[PDB]
Structure formats: structure tokens, C-alpha cells
Design a protein around this ligand. Structure first.
Ligand SMILES: O=C(O)[C@@H](CO)OP(=O)(O)O
Ligand SMILES: [Mg+2]
Ligand SMILES: [Mg+2]
Ligand SMILES: [Mg+2]
Ligand SMILES: [Mg+2]
Lengths: 433, 432
């Protein structure tokens, strides 16, 4: 049983408060922290903030902390359940909150406990966390994911005009996860020089996720810079490109604004059809193999149309919000073919595992993801390996809220020894390996 | 005794390889990682890189890792020394490398192990790491430091024209360490707005240490922006400024180039006397209370003249390189009055603590510091508390290789409960 829980406010990678939970068992102290998005979908579970303008401009999380310390902790201690019992403990908290969207305690309160319970459960089983998560999920043969590194940041994550949020490189042809890290970092460092030589050293500062934040508007230009760096590093055959458009961020009165960080001028807005044609040009002109959130979270007909007209991976993020109800609708409508898995969009480990299994049972890919506000926590590294999803995005190889996960995936690969397998070109469907 | 030591390459906060060590005892696994500087003093102990231009652009650390796995690990295990014996185990590694500057294995090989030994030692003693470090140093009470947050980045840490490297805020009037965090973070976020209002969104991206990187050239404009942010956040009476000039980076032919990131033009170079005049104007016009590396690492005359003409804290960093022999010289010549403490400039925990003690015995402050390439390691948070230094600089409150240390200091303060003290206005001389 749980001996004691103590939660506190720490600061995330942008300097904003977030929740951290210490949980004590006879095995010792286990600690987890909760991430926080910036381009947050409207259907995400509630992130409870205090709203005290006198403190962190209203962004404290003292209310979430107190719900954990004073209500959730005695509930879970009273239950007497072992920390191994992830589903029972998560269900106790979902029932005690009692709301659909976790609006009584906050998804941040519930998740911080859910994650700390999962870490203590792995220790109680005397297993690494990724193996405990594999058993929770019913998986046997574990696989390292292809990392998807967001090397040029735009949208709501960067100070630039560039509207689309993330331009990622995926070393699908690497030999191992450790080799994927070398490929990704070499391209990233090559790209700093490509940008410096063109735009100047002032275009080589970074955005929230560690990608460069060059002063450019045109999304094709970000793609051209990434392709140039791939080729200059000598990895044209081995590295492909993914995008996260985060189109909900720039959806305006049924159109889309590719210059949404410039003062509002509706004459520049474009139709979903124009925007889809742009994506088709990108897929033709560059090695783009994955596009996430190409349309707004409510623009279902545009998603179904586009997915039917391409052969690449199309990832639901704000469309699906890690939420079985929304995933079912996206399956029915054939809106996308991959789920972005964010524990804090739904609020518990159990529910996230269920969302992952639901997408996998319907033949979708699943890409585990960080949030743009991260912490030193590395849980998602063990999560993607235990869930065997084959693909994770958790930052450029820059800023250690990103590298902490990448470093942990290198450690897991080392630990697996001869048993390690890398998803490679099977990142959409690694269950075949 | 040590059961197993295993080193690996991980990536640091810039995406470059660095050394990580796992050390196993009967008490479990103890892991540490090594930071890496950009504006590295010429007198720093050697950071060993592989130089293979094809792999990580020559920045691999496979040779340092191999020195640990093939040489240092079996020697320490074979010795049977307990992990509590920090000095014997560090001295063994110094003698195994055999060179003054750690140029055979790298300071990065030796330090990775030294740090993991110290974590394992604390566990053997059944102490938290900060209390083990206090026992190693002979300290009996602990104090939380004032944090110094680098909120505008310049020099070699950022893409802009600013020559001076760091413009830091210090919440000396905060109530506690946790309150100092709130004041630093509120000022930081207020600063983003001040910069966006004046320079637009392109000016709000961040440099290596998480400070903003606006494309400005005047170092006084950085100070003006920081001062404006402090005032707009409502904290004029509680937050002051520190700078790290990192002047070795712009020393040229016996003079100084404050426009160094623009094409070479000796006609704009200034002397050390002119640079000191400019610092005195900053101290008059802004709440600057501390200046680090105001002159080059070899320009002793300028250091001693300037220290004798001002009352602010004058911090040696590249001058002193956490090295007792250089600190002895700086004490004799009165070159500075505070030591920047970087374990990786000297290469072992034992020598960093000796450096700290030497500076404190001679009346100097000590500011523990990160490097601009950091990891998720939090050792230096426990180090600053255990050595009772009163001040730490470990980043803007942005990028979690910075926040991991600040968050750990908040945990330490919480753990100390009623016993917790905050150095506050006594940050230069907490021994009072
Ligand atoms: O939109 C996204 O996919 C994420 C992760 O990169 O960003 P945020 O956490 O800001 O939603
Ligand atoms: Mg988003
Ligand atoms: Mg997204
Ligand atoms: Mg330096
Ligand atoms: Mg310095």
C-alpha cells in the first residue's frame, strides 16, 4: 500500500508552475511531474490553474496540489491497494473526481498521482518502468521508437511569422536508437550552420521545443532548410520529415490564416482546399511522410477528405485529444490514421493506455508525445517502449526537458541488450517486428 | 566497495555528447552526468573530445567513456575503497591520469565518476547528498542560496550582437528560496512582454541558458530592459542585477573588442581602463551588484585595479578556473572577491571543495555555477547548499536543464522545514 503522498509546485521548461508528486512506499520515494501545453485543443481534459493574478500571473497550481495532498492521497491510502494496481487506483481517482473532463480536481492533479503510482508500481514489481507498462498494456516484445525531432519551431512555440508549428526529422533508416540520436543531432547541428549562413546568427536562437526559430514566414522555406541540412549531413536516404501544422491555432471563420502572428487581415486567409493543395505540394516536393493536425479540431470533413487522398501518416492531436470518444468518431469517419498520445490530454495512465490500444486495434499508428511545456520527468520514454508504438516526438535534440527523454531511451536500448529492436521503417506499425 | 561502474555518451542541452556514469553499490544505482562549457577558459582542466569530424562534428566522447569503462572503473573497484572515501577515490583518479590538467583521460572522464562516487557516498552514510557534501566540507549548517537567473543572453551563448555574455537577476529581497523562484519567474515573463512590446516577437526566442536573445548591440540596453522588467513586475526593492562579461572571449592583442561579433576593426578596440570606466557607469546607472570576468583571464593588472576601485562583487571565473593554485594568486593580488565554482573546470569533487574552502577562508564569496551546456543532473543544487555558499547561477527560469536545479533547491528547502534559512541580503557573505 501507499505510505504517504506529497505534491508540490515546480516550474516547467517555460518557467510556469506545474504539478509534481512524491509518492512513498516501502521501496522508497517515487516522483513524477506533469507537462503543460501551449497549443491546447478545446477538448482536452481540464488543466486546473489557480487564477490568482498576484502570483505567477494566475498560473499557480496550488489548487491542484491541495486536491492531491488533502483529498486524493488519503483516498488512495484508505483503499489499501498495491501500487501495482494501476487501473484500480486510477479508477478510484476518476470516480472521486466524478466529472467527465476532470474539472473538479484538474487532470493535472489526477495525472501527477497516476504517473507517481505507475513508477512506484514498476519498483514494487522489481521491473524497469517500460516493462511494468508493457505488462499493464498486455505487450511482450518491446521495441525502441523512431524519434521525431522538431528542429524548426513555428506557430505558438516560436517568435517568428512561420504559422505551422513543427518541422520534424525522423531517422527511420538509423541502425538503432542510439544511431537515430547521432543522425538527429548531426542534422540539427548542420541545420544551425545552414540557417546561420543564410539568415544570420540571429535566426539560430531556439523556440519552446528547442528547434531553431528563424525569421521566416513561408512553411515551404522551413521544409527547404530541413531538407538541405539532411542532405548536407549525408543522410538523404535515412531521414524523412514529419510536420505538426497545429491548424486549430490559425483557424478563423471557416478559413485558415498562414500569417496569424501578423496583425489581423482577413484578405490573406485561405480555404481548407488551398491548404490541402499546399500539403500535397509538400508531400511531392519533400520527403514528408507524416502530417499532424492538418485541419482544425472541428473540421472533420477536411480531415476525412485529405486522409482519403494521401498515402502518408495523418496524425490526430487536437482532433482526438487522447480521448476514446473522439478516437471512435475519427475511426468511424476515417479522419486520420495515427493517434498522438498525450497523457495529460486525458488525465490518467490507464486512460492513455486504453486510448493507445483503441487506436492500435483499429490499425492506426500511435506517436507518443511530450507537451511544449515539459519537465525533467522521463516517464514518456518508458511509456513509448512499453506500449510498443514505434514513434515518439519529444523535442529537438536541444533543451534538456527534451534530451532527458532521448537519453532515457538510449539507456533503455542499452538495458535491453541483444533483445533491443528499433522500429525503423516500421514506425507506423511495429507489431510486425 | 564499488560493485560496477559503467559510463555512456548522452546528449547535453545543446545536443552535444557528454559523459554519464552509473555507479552501483549495495545501496543501488547512482548516476551523474558532466556539463560542458562554450566560453571555456584556457586554464580549465581538459575536456576530452574525440575529434572524429565525421561523428557528432568531432564532439563525441567515446574516448572519455572508454577511459572510464576500460581503466578508471576496474581500478576503483579493485581498490575496494568505500564510496565514503571521496578524497582517496578522487586522488586515485588524479594519479591514474598522471597529468596536471587531466589531459590523458579528460576532466570529463574523471568528474563523471567523482560525482557518482559522491552520490553513492551520501547513500552509504544514509544522508541526503547536500548533508554528505557539508560533512565533506566541514560545514554544520546549511543555507539556501540566492539564485542568479540569466535572463538576457549575449556573447558566445546567443545569436545577437551583444558582447557581454549574461545579464542576471538576483532576488536578494525574497522571503525564501521558493519565493525567489516566483520573483525570478515573474520578472522573466514580464521581460518577455517588455522585449516583445519594443522589438516584436522575433526578439523573444532564447539562447543557450534560456535567456532572451533580442538582436541588440548595446550592453546598457540589455540592462535597461532588465531594469524595466524588474520595475514593471513590482520588484524594484527586492531584485538586483549581476553580469558575466566573459571578457576573455573578446580580448584581442592586449585590448578588448565590444563589437566582436561584427567584422574585425581594431579601431573600435578599447583598453582595460576604458572597460572599467564603462562598468562604473553601469554600476551608477543600474542596480548592478556583481560583475563576473570583467577582464581577460590573464589581465591581472586590470582585475586588481578595478577590484580596488569599486565595492561591487567581482567574480573570478576564467581567471580562477575553480583551481586552488590560481585562486592563491588571485587572493595575493586581490584580483577579485568571489569565486565562480564549476566542478568541471577542475575535474573532481575533492578539488572543487578545496577551491571553495580556500576562497571562503580568505573572505571571498563563492557562487556555484552551471555550464552553458548542461544536463538533467541536479548535483550542483545539493553542492551549493552543502557548501553554504549563499549564491548559485544555473540559468534563466527556462529550459529544464536549468529548472532541474532550481526545482531541486525548492525540494531541499521544503525538506529542511523550520531549519531552512535563505541567504537573501547576505548572499556575498552568508557566514554571518
Ligand atoms: O501541439 C503539439 O503537438 C504539442 C507538442 O509538441 O504542443 P503543445 O503541447 O503546445 O500542444
Ligand atoms: Mg498543441
Ligand atoms: Mg500537435
Ligand atoms: Mg565561460
Ligand atoms: Mg563566466
Amino acid at each position: 500500500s501507499i505510505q504517504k503522498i506529497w505534491a508540490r509546485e515546480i516550474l516547467d521548461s517555460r518557467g510556469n508552475p506545474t504539478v509534481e508528486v512524491d509518492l512513498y512506499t516501502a521501496k522508497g520515494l517515487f516522483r513524477a511531474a506533469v507537462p503543460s501545453g501551449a497549443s491546447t485543443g478545446i477538448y482536452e481534459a481540464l488543466e486546473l490553474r489557480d487564477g490568482d493574478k498576484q502570483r505567477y500571473l494566475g498560473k499557480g497550481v496550488l489548487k491542484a496540489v491541495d486536491h492531491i495532498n488533502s483529498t486524493i492521497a488519503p483516498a488512495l491510502i484508505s483503499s489499501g491497494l498495491s501500487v501495482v494496481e494501476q487501473e484500480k487506483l486510477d479508477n478510484l481517482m476518476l470516480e472521486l473526481d466524478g466529472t467527465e473532463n476532470k474539472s473538479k480536481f484538474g487532470a493535472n492533479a489526477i495525472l501527477g498521482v497516476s504517473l507517481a503510482v505507475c513508477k512506484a508500481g514498476a519498483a514494487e514489481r522489481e521491473l524497469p518502468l517500460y516493462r511494468h507498462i508493457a505488462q499493464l498494456a498486455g505487450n511482450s516484445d518491446l521495441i525502441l521508437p523512431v524519434p521525431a525531432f522538431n528542429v524548426i519551431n513555428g506557430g505558438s512555440h516560436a517568435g517568428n511569422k512561420l504559422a505551422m508549428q513543427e518541422f520534424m526529422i525522423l531517422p527511420v533508416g538509423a541502425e538503432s536508437f542510439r544511431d537515430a540520436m547521432r543522425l538527429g543531432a548531426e542534422v540539427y547541428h548542420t541545420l544551425k550552420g545552414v540557417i546561420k549562413d543564410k539568415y544570420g546568427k540571429d535566426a539560430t536562437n531556439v523556440g519552446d521545443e528547442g528547434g531553431f526559430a528563424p525569421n521566416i514566414l513561408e512553411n515551404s522555406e522551413a521544409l527547404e532548410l530541413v531538407k538541405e541540412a539532411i542532405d548536407k549531413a549525408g543522410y538523404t536516404e535515412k531521414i524523412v520529415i514529419g510536420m505538426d501544422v497545429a491548424a486549430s491555432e490559425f483557424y478563423r471563420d471557416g478559413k485558415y490564416d498562414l500569417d496569424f502572428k501578423s496583425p489581423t487581415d482577413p484578405s490573406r486567409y485561405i480555404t481548407g482546399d488551398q491548404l490541402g493543395a499546399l500539403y500535397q505540394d509538400f508531400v511531392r516536393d519533400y520527403p514528408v511522410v507524416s502530417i499532424e493536425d492538418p485541419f482544425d479540431q472541428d473540421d472533420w470533413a477536411a480531415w476525412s477528405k485529405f486522409t482519403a487522398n494521401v498515402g502518408i501518416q495523418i496524425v490526430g492531436d487536437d482532433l482526438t485529444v487522447t480521448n476514446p470518444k473522439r478516437i471512435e468518431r475519427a475511426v468511424e469517419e476515417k479522419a486520420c490514421n495515427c493517434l498522438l498520445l498525450k497523457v495529460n490530454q486525458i488525465g490518467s495512465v490507464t486512460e492513455a493506455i486504453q486510448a493507445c490500444k483503441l487506436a492500435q486495434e483499429n490499425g492506426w499508428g500511435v506517436m507518443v508525445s511530450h507537451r511544449s511545456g515539459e519537465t525533467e520527468d522521463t516517464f514518456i520514454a518508458d511509456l513509448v517502449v512499453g506500449l510498443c508504438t514505434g514513434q515518439i516526438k519529444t523535442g529537438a535534440p536541444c533543451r534538456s526537458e527534451r534530451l532527458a527523454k532521448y537519453n532515457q531511451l538510449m539507456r533503455i536500448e542499452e538495458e535491453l541488450g541483444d533483445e533491443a529492436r528499433f522500429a525503423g521503417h516500421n514506425f507506423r506499425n511495429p507489431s510486425v517486428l
